[PDB]
mmCIF file of C-alpha atoms in Angstrom:
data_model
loop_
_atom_site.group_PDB
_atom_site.id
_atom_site.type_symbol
_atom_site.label_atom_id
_atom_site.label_comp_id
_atom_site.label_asym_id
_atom_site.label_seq_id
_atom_site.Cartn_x
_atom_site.Cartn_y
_atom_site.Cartn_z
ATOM 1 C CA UNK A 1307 55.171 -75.039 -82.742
ATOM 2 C CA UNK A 1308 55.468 -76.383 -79.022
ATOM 3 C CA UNK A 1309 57.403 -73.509 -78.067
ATOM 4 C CA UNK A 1310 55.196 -71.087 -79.551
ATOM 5 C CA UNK A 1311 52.075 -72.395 -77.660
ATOM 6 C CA UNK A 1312 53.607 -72.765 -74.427
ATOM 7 C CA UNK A 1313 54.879 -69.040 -73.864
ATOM 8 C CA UNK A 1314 50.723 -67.883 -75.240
ATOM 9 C CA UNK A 1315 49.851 -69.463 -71.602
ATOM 10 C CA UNK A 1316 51.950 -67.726 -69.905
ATOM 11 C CA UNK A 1317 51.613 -64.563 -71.855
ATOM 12 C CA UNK A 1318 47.429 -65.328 -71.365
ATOM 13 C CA UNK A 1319 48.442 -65.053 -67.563
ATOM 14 C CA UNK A 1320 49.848 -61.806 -66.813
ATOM 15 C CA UNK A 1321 46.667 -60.129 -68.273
ATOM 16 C CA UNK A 1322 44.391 -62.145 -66.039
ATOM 17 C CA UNK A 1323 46.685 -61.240 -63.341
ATOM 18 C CA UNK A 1324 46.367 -57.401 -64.678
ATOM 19 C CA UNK A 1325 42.872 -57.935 -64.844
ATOM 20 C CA UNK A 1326 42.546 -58.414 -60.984
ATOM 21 C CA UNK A 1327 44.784 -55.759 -60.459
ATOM 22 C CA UNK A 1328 42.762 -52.712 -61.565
ATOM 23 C CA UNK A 1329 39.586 -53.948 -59.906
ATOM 24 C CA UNK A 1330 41.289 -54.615 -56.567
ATOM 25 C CA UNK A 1331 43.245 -52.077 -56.386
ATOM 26 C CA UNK A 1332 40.476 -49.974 -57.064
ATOM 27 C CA UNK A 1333 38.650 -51.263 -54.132
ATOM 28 C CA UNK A 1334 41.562 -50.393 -51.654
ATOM 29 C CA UNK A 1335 41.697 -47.178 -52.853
ATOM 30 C CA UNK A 1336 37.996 -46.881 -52.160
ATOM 31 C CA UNK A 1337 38.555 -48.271 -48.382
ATOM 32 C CA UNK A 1338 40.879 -45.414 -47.303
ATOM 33 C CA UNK A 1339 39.024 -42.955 -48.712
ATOM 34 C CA UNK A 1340 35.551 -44.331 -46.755
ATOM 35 C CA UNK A 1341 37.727 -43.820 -43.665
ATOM 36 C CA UNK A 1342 38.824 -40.467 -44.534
ATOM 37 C CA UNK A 1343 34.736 -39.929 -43.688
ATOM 38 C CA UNK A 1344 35.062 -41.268 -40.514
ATOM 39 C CA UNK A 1345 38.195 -39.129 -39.492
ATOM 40 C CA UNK A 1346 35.919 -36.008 -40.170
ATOM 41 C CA UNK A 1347 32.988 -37.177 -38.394
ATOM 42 C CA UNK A 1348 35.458 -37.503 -35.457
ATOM 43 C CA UNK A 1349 37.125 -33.679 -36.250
ATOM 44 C CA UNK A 1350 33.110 -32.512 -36.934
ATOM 45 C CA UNK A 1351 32.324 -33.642 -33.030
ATOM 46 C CA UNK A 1352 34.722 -31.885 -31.391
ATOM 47 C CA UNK A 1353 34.360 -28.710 -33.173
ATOM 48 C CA UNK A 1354 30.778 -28.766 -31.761
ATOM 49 C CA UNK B 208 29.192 -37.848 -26.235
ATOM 50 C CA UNK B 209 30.729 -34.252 -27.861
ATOM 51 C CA UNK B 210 27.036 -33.523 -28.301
ATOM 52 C CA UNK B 211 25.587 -34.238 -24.938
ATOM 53 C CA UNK B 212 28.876 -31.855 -23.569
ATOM 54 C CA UNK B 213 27.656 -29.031 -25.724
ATOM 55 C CA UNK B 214 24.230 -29.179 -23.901
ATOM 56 C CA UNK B 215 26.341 -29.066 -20.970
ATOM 57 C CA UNK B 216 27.942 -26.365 -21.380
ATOM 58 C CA UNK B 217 24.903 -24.086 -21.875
ATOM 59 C CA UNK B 218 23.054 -25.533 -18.428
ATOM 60 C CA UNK B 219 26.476 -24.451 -16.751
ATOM 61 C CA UNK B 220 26.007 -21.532 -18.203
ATOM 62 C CA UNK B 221 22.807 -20.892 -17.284
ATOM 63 C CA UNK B 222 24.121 -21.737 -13.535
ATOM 64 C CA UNK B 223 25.905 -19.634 -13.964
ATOM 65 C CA UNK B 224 23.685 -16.680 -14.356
ATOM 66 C CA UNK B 225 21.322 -17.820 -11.843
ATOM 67 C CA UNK B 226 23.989 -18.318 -9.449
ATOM 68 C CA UNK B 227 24.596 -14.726 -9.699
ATOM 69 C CA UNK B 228 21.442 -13.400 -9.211
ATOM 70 C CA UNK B 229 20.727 -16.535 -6.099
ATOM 71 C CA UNK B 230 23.815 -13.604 -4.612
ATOM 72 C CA UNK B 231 22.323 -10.783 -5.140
ATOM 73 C CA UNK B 232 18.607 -12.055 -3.712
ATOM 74 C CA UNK B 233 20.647 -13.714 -0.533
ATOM 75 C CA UNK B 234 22.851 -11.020 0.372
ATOM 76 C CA UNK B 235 20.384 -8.202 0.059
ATOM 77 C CA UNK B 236 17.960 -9.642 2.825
ATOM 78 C CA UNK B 237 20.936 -10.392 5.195
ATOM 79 C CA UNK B 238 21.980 -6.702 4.979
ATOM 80 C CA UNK B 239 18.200 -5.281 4.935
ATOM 81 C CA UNK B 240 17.402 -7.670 8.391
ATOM 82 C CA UNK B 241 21.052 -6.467 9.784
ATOM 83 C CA UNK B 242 20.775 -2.469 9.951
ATOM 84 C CA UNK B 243 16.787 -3.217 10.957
ATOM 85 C CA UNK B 244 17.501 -5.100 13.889
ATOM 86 C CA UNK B 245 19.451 -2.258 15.635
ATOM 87 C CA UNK B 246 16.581 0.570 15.648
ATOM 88 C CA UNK B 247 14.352 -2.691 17.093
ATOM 89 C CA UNK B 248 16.516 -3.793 20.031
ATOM 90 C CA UNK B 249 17.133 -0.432 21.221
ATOM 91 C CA UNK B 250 13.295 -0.469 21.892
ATOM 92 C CA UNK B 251 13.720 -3.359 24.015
ATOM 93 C CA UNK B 252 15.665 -6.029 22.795
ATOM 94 C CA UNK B 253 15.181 -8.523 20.133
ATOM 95 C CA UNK B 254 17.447 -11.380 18.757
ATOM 96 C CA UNK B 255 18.472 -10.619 14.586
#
């Protein structure tokens, strides 16, 4: 019974950890891409 | 800064056609004044 509670912790765990995962990883994704905008302002200005 | 260059480059262009035509004016007066002053000092003399 001890044993049984113990490891539903740990299991509890590794989906808050997954939890942060998808948001934040999310949000990185999101960061390069907002800088991909500034890139092509850059490549827009010259062109001009 | 690429913007400001653009408008630049048309006002040396536009030098660039007045420049042209500041040669044709400038040359054309120097030549006119140069074959008159010939016929004029052989009636007495006159500095061009």
């Amino acid at each position: 019974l001890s044993l049984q509670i113990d490891a539903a912790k740990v299991e509890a765990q590794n989906q808050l950890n997954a939890a942060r995962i998808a948001e934040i990883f999310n949000n990185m994704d999101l960061s390069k891409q907002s800088e991909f905008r500034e890139f092509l302002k850059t490549v827009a200005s010259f062109q001009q | 800064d690429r913007s400001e260059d653009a408008r630049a480059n048309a006002e040396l262009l536009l030098k660039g056609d007045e420049q042209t035509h500041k040669q044709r004016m400038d040359i054309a007066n120097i030549l006119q004044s140069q074959r008159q002053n010939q016929p004029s000092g052989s009636v007495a003399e006159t500095p061009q």
